[PDB]
Design a protein around this ligand. Structure first.
Ligand SMILES: *[C@@H]1O[C@H](CO)[C@@H](O[C@@H]2O[C@H](CO)[C@@H](O[C@@H]3O[C@H](CO)[C@@H](O)[C@H](O)[C@H]3NC(C)=O)[C@H](O)[C@H]2NC(C)=O)[C@H](O)[C@H]1NC(C)=O
Ligand SMILES: *[C@@H]1O[C@H](CO)[C@@H](O[C@@H]2O[C@H](CO)[C@@H](O[C@@H]3O[C@H](CO)[C@@H](O)[C@H](O)[C@H]3NC(C)=O)[C@H](O)[C@H]2NC(C)=O)[C@H](O)[C@H]1NC(C)=O
Ligand SMILES: *[C@@H]1O[C@H](CO)[C@@H](O[C@@H]2O[C@H](CO)[C@@H](O)[C@H](O)[C@H]2NC(C)=O)[C@H](O)[C@H]1NC(C)=O
Ligand SMILES: *[C@@H]1O[C@H](CO)[C@@H](O[C@@H]2O[C@H](CO)[C@@H](O)[C@H](O)[C@H]2NC(C)=O)[C@H](O)[C@H]1NC(C)=O
Ligand SMILES: *[C@@H]1O[C@H](CO)[C@@H](O[C@@H]2O[C@H](CO)[C@@H](O)[C@H](O)[C@H]2NC(C)=O)[C@H](O)[C@H]1NC(C)=O
Ligand SMILES: *[C@@H]1O[C@H](CO)[C@@H](O)[C@H](O)[C@H]1NC(C)=O
Ligand SMILES: *[C@@H]1O[C@H](CO)[C@@H](O)[C@H](O)[C@H]1NC(C)=O
Ligand SMILES: *[C@@H]1O[C@H](CO)[C@@H](O)[C@H](O)[C@H]1NC(C)=O
Ligand SMILES: [Zn+2]
Length: 875
């Protein structure tokens, strides 16, 4: 009404990107929520540096509306007269036209634009919203913001691009029973009424809109003090207060570690963490006020698993990295998102490794990021680390494996090649140089290039400006050539067009008889290089440190299998995991005969280490899933792999004993035994489940999930299903809730799974943050595979209306179709996609899952007989 929508395209506001000549300096932001009404109002005053004559001023606004006609101030101070305001939907702008137009701000004086606005707190997990929880039987409220990447514009009108850094003075008018939090400490509190308080926070440092955060809450707190003398506090519901202890510890330890490591002071006087009871992502690095999903912050040593502990520590560490990489220095544009995400995904491991010494975190990088993303990045529908993005949907889509895991992986490779000391020094200089500003990828290379004088830009550009990665083909023992590695052998290796033509500058490392050497394999060496003793065996890519695969000659592979059977200890745990991982990915890609890959699994009865078992379980899970309905192959694959894990599963037992890594190993090894149909392992699960149903016995924390899953799967019925649902409602611990949700998804009953799916529409039962997690759990169920898939189709309009097409998790839900492997299923997918062609943030996930399912169909055609033969001849 006040700024009506107009389809007028004849202006600079038709451009997706904000103009270069309008820059903000300072935001004066005031909001007043009506919590019990799910509304808020506010006024924002923005000081503006203008660089070019313009009759229009525009900025981002979505959903929230302008209520008062905006008012502009000349740098002199005079009121600039306003003809109209209008909204431009196509590019999420509100535009105001001055009567005549005005000129640049030449000195230290600035324009001032103020606008009044009103928005909603309901039906959303982005912008500024309210959610509830129960305390001593009463329903309580908490309101908070979530902006990354393009949702600040929903909270309040702003210049909502990461490079438009400005300073912030925030105030909130809230009922007095509530506290108010933001990025900065409280400056002053003043009574509006005897019912209302105005909380004003001190001026911010220059920062991006996506980092701006405020909250209205009635939470208790757990407190700590950094070595800096600055308060680090975690806000938490009173009844959950005890579960904030571990996070508080790790925050302290990792905060102190990073500040020293980066040789730079944390820029704010305090740091707060808070878990919002319903929160749409894992966590968000809002400067000085980091928001969490409860599962990533709140941990109970008496009820939570080692897996949970590691998750909490890692996400906390992750969020802390951002206070330097992301917050102090921010990428200039979303195309360089990896400068934020990859860095956090890398340093999170260094942080947690400092806090928790015997966790082998450095090695766990292979399991968490390196090897999983080498799967992702072997698809044609991957994308380069530096990604062209032209819509909000495209922007949000790139918060993915490539930005996080491949980002992390190529930094891991870079560090090892360039040496840790120089990497560390180079990071510091980057952080010194671009503090409170924005950087491009080019800026980071130059920084490390100053610290090494090694050709960082020349080498790292090849890993950064094109998708994919190479396989090193071994001829002789030491001639290597490079070739792009693609899972689909039919795919055109030169597509999509790359200036670098899918060749890489590969820092190559290798071990000759316990001694290590290093060579940069140059792109221009078209016919390959030769590795510089009289050797009978060369170990290329130790600890899988380089982001590539090594395809040895078949004879070498055959010798490796034999060396593993004789004494697997000859190789390090990481090397074993890497060799197994490569071999199975190579077999999957039709670059190595499956018999050769499977031969590597023969030694496993003697395998006792975490890393190899994890990557074995990963490779087997795929193969088993492809033969799930094959009555001929399946029992043979089951029988064999059951036999291979049995010794280690039996040896570790059904009890929480040993160090961190052992406990993680026990979980995944017993899980695999159960998955492979080991009667005794299933009987342990059912026995413990039967005991848990008796209401007293608290299950061993690292066995719980397995007991809920396989217990429900093997002996669950309506009685125990209803009981489990009650327990899920009754527990305050989100980490327990989540396990119980997986339990509920495991019942072998169509009626009960149908009841479960219906609960997804009930916001009193399933939180908005948890809906996709549940759909995915149900999709893993032998009945639920098609149930979840059918349900998201039938309810697609409902989901789109609830979440919007800009929602990343909604875009991704189609990946529940990954196990599909028939022409019929592929046709179903294509038919559904054709019916709802507006994919939004699901555009890439759709491309990826289609490629996967097409690969699956081909894989079955190519390998069924070979794999059948290997198993038949063995058993
Ligand atoms: C939970 O899982 C355990 C396996 O991890 C089960 O424990 C096993 O039970 C088996 C059956 O009683 C035992 O079988 C005997 O094992 C010895 C090996 O030393 C063989 O020689 C025997 O031939 C074999 N059967 C006989 C003598 O008839 C296992 O030894 C035993 N223990 C282990 C460590 O494997 C638990 O039974 C199971 N718990 C529940 C509640 O089901
Ligand atoms: C790498 O994999 C190779 C291919 O699978 C292995 O070579 C095979 O070993 C099998 C052992 O299970 C042999 O199976 C036998 O096949 C004959 C039919 O020709 C059957 O009558 C036998 O009963 C059967 N053995 C059993 C136990 O049932 C294969 O014959 C054999 N194939 C060839 C061509 O050699 C290699 O052993 C393996 N290399 C390793 C482990 O280092
Ligand atoms: C939040 O709640 C308000 C009021 O309950 C919603 O506004 C109503 O939306 C319905 C359906 O679109 C309309 O029929 C009503 O006319 C609206 N009422 C008013 C006063 O606007 C609002 O849409 C909800 N917001 C979100 C994001 O779901
Ligand atoms: C957080 O750290 C504190 C203090 O650093 C831990 O408290 C110690 O726990 C150990 C073993 O439980 C005891 O022997 C000590 O007496 C405690 N105090 C100190 C100063 O060492 C606490 O366990 C940690 N929090 C967790 C695990 O969440
Ligand atoms: C398990 O839970 C359901 C749901 O609470 C129980 O109640 C029935 O649920 C159906 C839907 O499945 C409703 O149509 C009925 O109104 C419910 N009957 C009632 C409330 O009496 C069901 O009875 C429970 N079963 C067991 C064995 O506990
Ligand atoms: C203003 O916009 C420019 C766009 O180049 C950006 O780089 C800068 O960070 C913004 N803020 C300030 C305070 O200069
Ligand atoms: C490997 O390359 C070197 C140098 O080009 C050459 O001497 C040798 O013949 C090649 N082949 C093998 C199998 O070693
Ligand atoms: C599934 O659960 C329903 C509800 O209790 C029950 O009526 C039915 O017999 C069960 N069916 C199977 C196959 O277990
Ligand atoms: Zn992050």
């Amino acid at each position: 009404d006040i700024c009506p929508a107009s389809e007028d395209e004849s202006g600079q506001w038709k451009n997706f990107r904000l103009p270069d000549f309008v820059n903000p300096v300072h935001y004066d932001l005031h909001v007043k929520p009506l919590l019990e009404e799910d509304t808020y109002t506010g006024t924002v005053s923005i000081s503006i540096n203008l660089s070019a004559p313009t009759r229009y001023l525009w900025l981002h606004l979505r959903e929230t509306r302008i209520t008062r006609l905006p008012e502009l101030k000349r740098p002199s101070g005079d009121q600039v007269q306003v003809r109209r305001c209008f909204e431009y939907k196509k590019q999420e702008y509100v535009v105001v036209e001055a009567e005549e137009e005005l000129t640049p701000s030449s000195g230290d004086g600035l324009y001032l634009l103020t606008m009044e606005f009103a928005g909603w707190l309901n039906g959303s997990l982005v912008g500024f919203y309210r959610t509830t929880y129960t305390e001593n039987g009463r329903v309580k409220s908490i309101a908070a913001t979530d902006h990354e990447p393009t949702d600040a514009r929903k909270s309040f009108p702003c210049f909502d691009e990461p490079n438009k850094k400005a300073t912030y003075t925030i105030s909130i008018t809230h009922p007095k029973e509530y506290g108010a939090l933001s990025n900065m400490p409280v400056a002053k509190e003043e009574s509006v009424d005897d019912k209302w308080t105005r909380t004003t926070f001190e001026k911010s440092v220059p920062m991006s809109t996506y980092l701006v955060c405020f909250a209205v809450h009635q939470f208790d707190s757990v407190k700590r003090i950094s070595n800096s003398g600055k308060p680090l506090t975690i806000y938490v519901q009173p009844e959950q207060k005890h579960t904030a202890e571990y996070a508080a510890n790790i925050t302290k330890s990792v905060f102190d570690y990073f500040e020293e490591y980066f040789a730079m002071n944390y820029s704010l006087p305090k740091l707060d963490k808070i878990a919002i009871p319903d929160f749409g992502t894992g966590a968000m690095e809002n400067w000085g006020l980091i928001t969490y999903r409860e599962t990533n912050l709140l941990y109970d040593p008496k009820e939570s698993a080692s897996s949970n502990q590691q998750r909490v520590a890692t996400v906390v560490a992750h969020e802390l990295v951002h206070q330097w990489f992301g917050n102090i220095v921010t990428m200039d544009w979303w195309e360089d998102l990896w400068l934020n995400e990859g860095f956090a995904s890398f340093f999170e491991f260094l942080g947690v490794n400092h806090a928790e010494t015997d966790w082998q975190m450095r090695d766990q990088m292979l399991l968490e990021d390196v090897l999983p993303v080498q799967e992702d990045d072997s698809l044609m529908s991957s994308h380069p680390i530096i990604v062209t993005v032209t819509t909000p949907d495209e922007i949000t889509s790139v918060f993915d494996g490539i930005s996080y895991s491949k980002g992390s992986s190529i930094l891991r490779m870079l560090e090892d090649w360039i040496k840790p000391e120089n990497f560390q020094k180079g990071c510091q200089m980057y952080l010194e140089k671009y503090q409170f500003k924005n950087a491009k990828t080019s800026d980071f290379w130059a920084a490390l290039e100053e610290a090494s004088r090694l050709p960082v830009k020349e080498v790292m550009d090849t890993w950064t400006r094109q998708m994919g990665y190479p396989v090193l083909n071994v001829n002789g023992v030491k001639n290597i050539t490079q070739k792009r590695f693609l899972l689909d052998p039919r795919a055109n290796p030169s597509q999509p067009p790359s200036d670098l033509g899918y060749t890489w500058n590969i820092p190559v490392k290798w071990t000759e008889d316990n001694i290590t050497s290093s060579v940069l394999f140059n792109r221009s060496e078209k016919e390959g290089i030769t590795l510089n003793s009289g050797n009978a065996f060369l170990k290329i890519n130790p600890d899988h440190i380089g982001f590539y695969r090594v395809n040895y000659e078949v004879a070498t592979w055959d010798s490796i299998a034999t060396a593993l059977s004789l004494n697997h200890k000859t190789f390090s745990s990481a090397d074993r995991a890497s060799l197994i991982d490569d071999a199975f990915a190579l077999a999957r890609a039709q670059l190595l005969d499956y018999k050769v890959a499977l031969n590597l699994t023969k030694y496993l009865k003697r395998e006792e280490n975490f890393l190899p078992w994890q990557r074995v379980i990963s490779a087997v899970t795929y193969i088993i899933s492809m033969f799930e309905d094959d009555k001929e192959l399946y029992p043979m694959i089951e029988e064999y792999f059951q036999g291979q894990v049995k010794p280690i599963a039996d040896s570790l037992g059904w009890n929480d004993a040993g160090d961190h890594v052992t406990k993680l190993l026990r979980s995944s090894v017993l899980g695999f035994a159960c998955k492979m149909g080991d009667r005794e392992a299933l009987n342990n699960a059912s026995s413990l489940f039967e005991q848990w149903l008796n209401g007293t016995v608290s299950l061993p924390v690292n066995l719980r999930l397995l007991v809920y899953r396989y217990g429900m799967q093997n002996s669950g019925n309506e009685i125990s299903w209803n009981y489990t649902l009650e327990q899920y409602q009754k527990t305050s611990l989100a980490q327990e809730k989540e396990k119980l949700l997986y339990g509920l998804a495991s019942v072998k009953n169509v009626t009960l799974l149908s009841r479960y799916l219906d609960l997804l529409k009930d916001t009193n039962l399933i939180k908005t943050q948890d809906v996709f997690t549940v759909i995915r759990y149900i999709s893993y169920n032998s009945y639920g595979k098609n149930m979840a898939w059918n349900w998201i189709q039938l309810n697609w309009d409902y989901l789109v209306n609830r979440y919007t097409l800009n929602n990343r998790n909604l875009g991704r839900i189609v990946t529940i179709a990954e196990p599909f492997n028939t022409e019929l299923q592929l046709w179903q997918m294509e038919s559904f996609f054709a019916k709802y062609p507006q994919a939004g943030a699901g555009e890439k996930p759709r491309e990826q899952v289609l490629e996967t399912v097409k690969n699956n169909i081909e894989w079955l055609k190519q390998h069924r007989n070979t794999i059948r033969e290997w198993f038949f001849n063995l058993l």
